Amino acid sequence: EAPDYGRGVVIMDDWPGYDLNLFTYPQHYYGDLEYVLIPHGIIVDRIERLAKDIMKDIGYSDIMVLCVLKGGYKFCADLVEHLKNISRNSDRFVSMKVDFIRLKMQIIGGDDLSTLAGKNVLIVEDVVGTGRTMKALLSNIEKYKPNMIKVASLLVKRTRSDGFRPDYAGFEIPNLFVVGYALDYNEYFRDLNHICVINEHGKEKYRV
Amino acid sequence: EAPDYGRGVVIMDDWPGYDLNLFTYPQHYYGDLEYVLIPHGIIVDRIERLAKDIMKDIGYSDIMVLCVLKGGYKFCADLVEHLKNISRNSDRFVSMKVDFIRLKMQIIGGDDLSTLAGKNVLIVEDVVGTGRTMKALLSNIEKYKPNMIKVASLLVKRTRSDGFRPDYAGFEIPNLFVVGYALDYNEYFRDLNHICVINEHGKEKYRV
Amino acid sequence: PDYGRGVVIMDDWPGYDLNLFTYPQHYYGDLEYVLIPHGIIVDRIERLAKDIMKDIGYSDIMVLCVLKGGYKFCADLVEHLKNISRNSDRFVSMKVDFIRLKSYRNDQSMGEMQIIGGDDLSTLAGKNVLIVEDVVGTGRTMKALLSNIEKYKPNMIKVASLLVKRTGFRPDYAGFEIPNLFVVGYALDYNEYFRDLNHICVINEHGKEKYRV
Amino acid sequence: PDYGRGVVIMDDWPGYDLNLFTYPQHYYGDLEYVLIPHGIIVDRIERLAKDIMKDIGYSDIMVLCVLKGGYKFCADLVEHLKNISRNSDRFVSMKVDFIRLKSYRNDQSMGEMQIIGGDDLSTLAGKNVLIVEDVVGTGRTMKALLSNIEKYKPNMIKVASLLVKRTGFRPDYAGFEIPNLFVVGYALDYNEYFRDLNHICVINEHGKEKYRV
Ligand SMILES: Nc1nc2c(ncn2[C@@H]2O[C@H](COP(=O)(O)O)[C@@H](O)[C@H]2O)c(=O)[nH]1
Ligand SMILES: Nc1nc2c(ncn2[C@@H]2O[C@H](COP(=O)(O)O)[C@@H](O)[C@H]2O)c(=O)[nH]1
Ligand SMILES: Nc1nc2c(ncn2[C@@H]2O[C@H](COP(=O)(O)O)[C@@H](O)[C@H]2O)c(=O)[nH]1
Ligand SMILES: Nc1nc2c(ncn2[C@@H]2O[C@H](COP(=O)(O)O)[C@@H](O)[C@H]2O)c(=O)[nH]1
Ligand SMILES: [Ca+2]
Ligand SMILES: [Ca+2]
Ligand SMILES: [Ca+2]
Ligand SMILES: [Ca+2]
Ligand SMILES: [Ca+2]
Ligand SMILES: [Ca+2]
Ligand SMILES: [Ca+2]
Ligand SMILES: [Ca+2]
């Protein structure tokens, strides 16, 4: 069968990744990372395609971007930049507003979400693991009666049968733990450019 | 006298700005903007210098970046990228953590700010007008006893004698109202790339 | 008003202070001020690309880069055209070529121009040609090049120049209209120096002497 | 292990599916798959620049771009070197030149190489030269170029090549070590097409026929 492109870029279980010594990375993490799972540049290239897909699907009306902090911030900043790039340099434009929330399910911060009523909402999230977080978030947002909700997740783990399938998925990754590109381990590694797998040394060094 | 470079790039009262027809911008704002005050690219060039200055001053230890949402998000994303660029491509590196707050003074969202105790905090803000907001914020953050607090503001208006002087200031602008580069008018114009002065048509079109 | 002139930089433009920006450390003390920051050049190129795509989209174009000074403007203009072509419903299919110009006088004092490098320019017959150049001064260089290319019977020739001096030749696409000053940076040189400078700048007397031939 | 080989792309590398990325619409249906996405090329160039700065920082270098295929790798490598030079305490002072190579056989079947364009290469005497090239195949081109430059007595010559094929010549700086396949994109061409393609790709049989000479 032809691929299901809705899965995003498929990173296989036997993917060895890229060797950190061949790329640049924050020097304070020297010795703390095992390998590069997804280089920064491939993330940006993939986001270019997602932005084009999103514009096709929901560019016909205003978009309310809802960033899921903190891990979503880089994917949201870059995705928004790509959408902006289209709205100014092509024939196709979309008015965007942006908001930011943190999840505890309690939603922390953000505007009064009654402002979402009748609007097209694009949730921007870092990674789907079990899918429980996204299912709960959708259930909470749906109560404000937006016109539609789309979920973009940079990463989706391959696991279970009760997963969550985002509308826009960057990469489908093995069921392992990832950091970088704003994703953290105990608040560290958000400043790392590439998505990486930490090594055992890093796991202990940054342990709480 | 030689210039006070702490003022940042000085945009004079008689600055005519740049004509929108010579640049790109979100097409949904066609007819809604008067002129470009500060092109996107000059903002990025200035941030490059600020990042270098910040690394000189406080790169010697970990930096806790505190983004003042929503208007600070683009300046914070770009400033962080420039700091990251230094931490990976030069000889000088700094570990950064990031957090996000909204101001109401109540601080909305963010981590437990007791985690700021004994740390070096870099507040990242969009624009200083009267300076009241930054003075109040500093007074609130100081109560958690960080080791030091630095304030980066992209813009500072030239006004009063009781102003606030940020540690890092991008541009000193005339005392007028600005949007773009995440700065809004009634939630609009955050997706505009350049910092602009809205025209009378835009003021009415987007009025609440 | 006349947008064909591009961004107008006025004679009393004081420019930007180097101390507020980053620049090559090896040129500290050689430059007087920034005439045009790197970032505004990129912003302006974005619009030139959009303008070019409006005029010649859905066609094949041969981009002809005038080395050496044109290389940075050409690389960036081409990237912006590529951007539109993959991210919008308009494209240009691009080929690229590179030429260097050497102007001289013959035995009766007639100006001649040798075109160095490049493909066999007979390959331009019936093609759409976009010349990409750094700066128009007197305009003599672009007038000579145009007549050289025109003899191969291209379908059309358009000229993009990053800078045009106020003193003439009018390019189809002009980034900035600048005072009549010698400028360097963004690949533009003084005696092969300063091409690695990011911002378009004016050099001081120390820089003029230090890098003199 | 041997990091001098660069990023190793294996023979059973399936590449990336074009349908998951953006690319020039005019090439839809001409390409089989993405061998190396644009973004990983940029990431790798970042590290090559850092490596080069470690080896030759605080010195003057002449960057020698091998046109046409080298232009994109050279523009981007140079931008990354410029980045370090203004944002760190190490710099290289750079000049740039451009050459095109034409290989032929003489009347006794000896391989010759004409160097087209460029400065008078006598100006390389005592200089540090960084050659920037797109791809090493058999290595014959780089061996010929090196011996041509060496006769002008430069202080040193280093070679950066974006791609090196497994089949030899070993550049000082190599981006990626690739299977022995014909590749295009990132300025690399097939019969002058595909230079405007963003990603390094392998073309299909339709593309091979359509753009044949
Ligand atoms: N940084 C990081 N966050 C993760 C990872 N896996 C899941 N998360 C985050 O953990 C939370 C739980 O995910 P869930 O299992 O509900 O899909 C979500 O906020 C998700 O984004 C991971 O590997 N790294
Ligand atoms: N978007 C936008 N925000 C502004 C402008 N001037 C001040 N602000 C914001 O208004 C608040 C009040 O500023 P203050 O007068 O206390 O310095 C701060 O959040 C400041 O960033 C402006 O011109 N545009
Ligand atoms: N680097 C540099 N080149 C210039 C400047 N002015 C003119 N040129 C170059 O000098 C040559 C002669 O320009 P023309 O007078 O024929 O327009 C052209 O190649 C033009 O691009 C300048 O200020 N700086
Ligand atoms: N566009 C393209 N050029 C190639 C490829 N392989 C080799 N070349 C170019 O072909 C010429 C001969 O390579 P050589 O065999 O001498 O290493 C060189 O200019 C080299 O850069 C390829 O796969 N694609
Ligand atoms: Ca999350
Ligand atoms: Ca987390
Ligand atoms: Ca503010
Ligand atoms: Ca506001
Ligand atoms: Ca020229
Ligand atoms: Ca010159
Ligand atoms: Ca070659
Ligand atoms: Ca070729």
Q: Is C117 annotated as a binding residue?
A: no
Dist CA A122 CA A148 (whole Å):
9
DSSP per-residue string spanning D110-126? -EEEEEESSS-GGGGTT
The distance of D169 to chain C (nearest Cα, Å) reads 26
Q: C3 vs B9: CB contact, 8 Å cut-off?
A: no
Specify the fold of D1-213: Rossmann fold (3.40.50)
Residues of B within 8 A of C21 (CB-CB) are 45-46, 48-49
Which residue has 């089989």 as its token pair?
A: D32
Strand partners, B107: B103
Do residues C40 and B194 make contact, with C-beta atoms less than 8 angstroms apart?
no
Do residues A206 and A186 make contact, with C-beta atoms less than 8 angstroms apart?
yes
Dist CA A49 CA A43 (whole Å):
10
Dist CA C96 CA B166 (whole Å):
48
What letter represents residue D183's amino acid? V
Nearest-CA residue of chain B relative to D85? Answer: B90
DSSP C98: E
Residues of D within 8 A of C190 (CB-CB) are none
- State if residue B124 touches ligand 2 by the CB under 6 angstroms criterion: no
Q: Is B100 annotated as a binding residue?
A: no
Nearest CB to D75: which of C26, C75, C198?
C75
Please give the helix or strand (H or E) that residue A89 lies within, else none: helix A73-89
The domain locations on chain A are 1-208
Dist CA D1 CA D7 (whole Å):
11
Dist CA C201 CA C203 (whole Å):
6
**Structure-derived torsion over alpha carbons of residues A10, A153, B29, B67, reported in degrees to the nearest 10:** -120
Task: Provide the experimental method for this PDB entry.
Answer: X-ray
Dist CA A164 CA A180 (whole Å):
22
Helices A73-89 and B73-89: crossing angle in degrees, nearest 10, is 110
Reference D186, options D24, D63, D25; nearest CA is D24
At a CB cut-off of 8 Å and minimum separation 6, what does B4 contact?
Answer: none
**CA angle centred on D78, ends A17 and C198, rounded to 5°:** 125
Please give the helix or strand (H or E) that residue D211 lies within, else none: none
Distances B174 to B60, B160, C121, D171 between C-alpha atoms, Å: 35, 13, 53, 54
Do residues B152 and B168 make contact, with C-beta atoms less than 8 angstroms apart?
yes
Reference B45, options A124, C69, C185, D57; nearest CA is C185
Do residues A35 and A16 make contact, with C-beta atoms less than 8 angstroms apart?
yes
Kind of pairing between the strands at A120-128 and A148-157: parallel
Which residue has 């996405």 as its token pair?
A: D37
C→B interface, C-beta within 8 Å: 3, 6-7, 16-17, 19-22, 37-44, 46-47, 50, 199
Helices D71-87 and B40-58: crossing angle in degrees, nearest 10, is 50
Please tell me whether the peptide bond between B135 and the residue prior to it is cis, using omega within 30 degrees of 0: no
Q: How many residues does chain C have?
A: 213
Dist CA D46 CA B185 (whole Å):
39
Distances D120 to A60, C72, D124 between C-alpha atoms, Å: 57, 22, 8
Which structure tokens are listed for C106?
Answer: 């013959």
At D129 the three-state DSSP class reads strand
Which residue from D74, D115, D141, D181 has its CB within 8 A of the most atoms of ligand 4, so it is best to mutate?
Answer: D141
Reference D70, options D207, D212, D155, D171; nearest CA is D171
Which structure tokens are listed for D87?
Answer: 């944002």
Which residue has 């390409």 as its token pair?
A: D31
Dist CA C63 CA C57 (whole Å):
14
Using a CB cutoff of 8 Å and minimum separation of 24, what contacts does A57-60 make?
A57/A150, A57/A167, A58/A94, A58/A120, A58/A122, A58/A148, A58/A150, A59/A86, A59/A92, A59/A93, A59/A94
Residues in chain A preceding a C-to-N separation beyond 2.5 angstroms (breaks): 104, 159
Sign of the alpha-carbon torsion through D151, D153, D154, D156: positive
Kind of pairing between the strands at D173-178 and D7-8: parallel
Strand partners, B150: B122
Kind of pairing between the strands at C173-178 and C156-165: parallel
Which residue has 């032809």 as its token pair?
A: A2
Question: Rg for chain B (alpha carbons), in Å?
Answer: 17
At a CB cut-off of 8 Å and minimum separation 6, what does C89 contact?
Answer: A90, A91, A92, D25
Reference C100, options D121, D73, D114, D118; nearest CA is D118
Residues in chain B preceding a C-to-N separation beyond 2.5 angstroms (breaks): 104, 159
Please tell me whether the peptide bond between A150 and the residue prior to it is cis, using omega within 30 degrees of 0: no
DSSP per-residue string spanning D156-203? EEEEEEEEEE------SEEEEEE-S---BBTTB-BTTBSTT-SSEEEE
- State if residue C145 touches ligand 3 by the CB under 6 angstroms criterion: no
Distances D113 to C114, D125, D145 between C-alpha atoms, Å: 22, 20, 8
> Up-side HSE of residue D128: CA atoms within 13 Å toward CB?
12
Where on the phi/psi map is residue C85: left (φ > 0), alpha (ψ -120 to 50), or beta? alpha
Reference B77, options A24, A96, A93, A181; nearest CA is A181
Dist CA B88 CA B91 (whole Å):
8
Dist CA B31 CA B34 (whole Å):
8
Chain centroid, CA D212 distance in Å:
23
- Which other chains touch chain D, taking contact as 3+ CB pairs less than 8 Å apart? A, B, C
DSSP C16: B
Strand partners, D65: D98, D132
Q: Hey, how many other C-beta atoms are within 10 angstroms of the C-beta on D204?
A: 14
DSSP per-residue string spanning B17-47? -B-GGGS---GGGTTTEEEEEE-HHHHHHHH
Dist CA D151 CA D144 (whole Å):
11
Q: C83 vs A92: CB contact, 8 Å cut-off?
A: no
Q: Can you give the resolution of this entry in Å?
A: 1.7
Which structure tokens are listed for D143?
Answer: 């061996």
Dist CA B82 CA B72 (whole Å):
15
Reference B94, options B121, B60, B51; nearest CA is B60
The distance of C182 to chain B (nearest Cα, Å) reads 22
Dist CA C108 CA A88 (whole Å):
53
Do residues D57 and D90 make contact, with C-beta atoms less than 8 angstroms apart?
yes
Q: C40 vs B44: CB contact, 8 Å cut-off?
A: no
Task: Write out the E strands in A55-188.
Answer: 63-69, 96-103, 107-108, 120-128, 148-157, 168-173
Which residue has 């890098």 as its token pair?
A: C211
Nearest CB to B26: which of A27, A84, A190?
A84
Dist CA B83 CA D201 (whole Å):
33
Residues of B within 8 A of D83 (CB-CB) are 85, 89
Dist CA C145 CA C153 (whole Å):
13
Dist CA D188 CA D185 (whole Å):
5
Dist CA D109 CA C99 (whole Å):
30
Do residues D66 and D31 make contact, with C-beta atoms less than 8 angstroms apart?
no
Q: D117 vs C100: CB contact, 8 Å cut-off?
A: yes
Residues of B within 8 A of C46 (CB-CB) are 23-24
Distances A78 to A167, A179, B74 between C-alpha atoms, Å: 18, 17, 10
- The CATH number that domain B1-208 falls under is 3.40.50.2020
Reference A61, options A144, A143, A148; nearest CA is A148
At a CB cut-off of 8 Å and minimum separation 6, what does D11 contact?
Answer: D166, D179
Kind of pairing between the strands at B120-128 and B107-108: unpaired
